[PDB]
Amino acid sequence: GSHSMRYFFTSVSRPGRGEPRFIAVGYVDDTQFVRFDSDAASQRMEPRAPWIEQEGPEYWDQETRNVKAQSQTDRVDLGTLRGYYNQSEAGSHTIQIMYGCDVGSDGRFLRGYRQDAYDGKDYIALNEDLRSWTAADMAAQITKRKWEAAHEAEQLRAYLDGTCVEWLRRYLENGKETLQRTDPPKTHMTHHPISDHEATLRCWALGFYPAEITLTWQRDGEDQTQDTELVETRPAGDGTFQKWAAVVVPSGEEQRYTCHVQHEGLPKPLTLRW
């Protein structure tokens, strides 16, 4: 199937309390594999999945060098952006960055992306053509003119549709047993009366991977969105995910309600009924 590699960077300023907190994490699909924590003793990019551990000293040196460089870029940007928004030296502020690439089941490039945020709000984003930028406000338009002038898009594109893909393809193979799997949802239904008039039906999806999934309820074929209670997909902690959707139904009419489950690991969508 298709796959992605994504890196996430968070820098949080700590006025009076030293350098900004910097945390980087890397994912292949929904599996994390590396981290860097500016507050940790090692000051090294660290492995976070068994299959990345086999990378040699040159790899960890390279990632450590480069992840530090990223932190220093972002640290300086915190000052710049504070100035752009005319904010005080006293308050804490956050820069978040996400970038990555997707490949098809043939290992070929599908698309690339990068988005930057300030204080949890869009700042600047690379467009789908990987040649142009979208600035969210007047401050970001300054950054945009700067990056257009410096041909930043071309450099990032060379990474997104080049080296990003090559590494992703390598990771996909070294981590094959973990990454090229699809664990279908183990599904079941629960049922509990709430009164003489109504009962709760909860449709469960457990132990699935990747996290992408869809649970929908229907009534005599009609979409029940939403007298439906639907929780966020959540990590089980063992590399799989969980999710449930529930409806409150008229006492004795459970037979009309169907839960529909869609997931990459299922040859056909499932239908559950009480």
Partner: peptide, 9 residues
């Protein structure tokens, strides 16, 4: 592997 050429805003 991460992007090797971060550029300031």
């Amino acid at each position: 592997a991460i992007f090797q050429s971060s550029m300031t805003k």
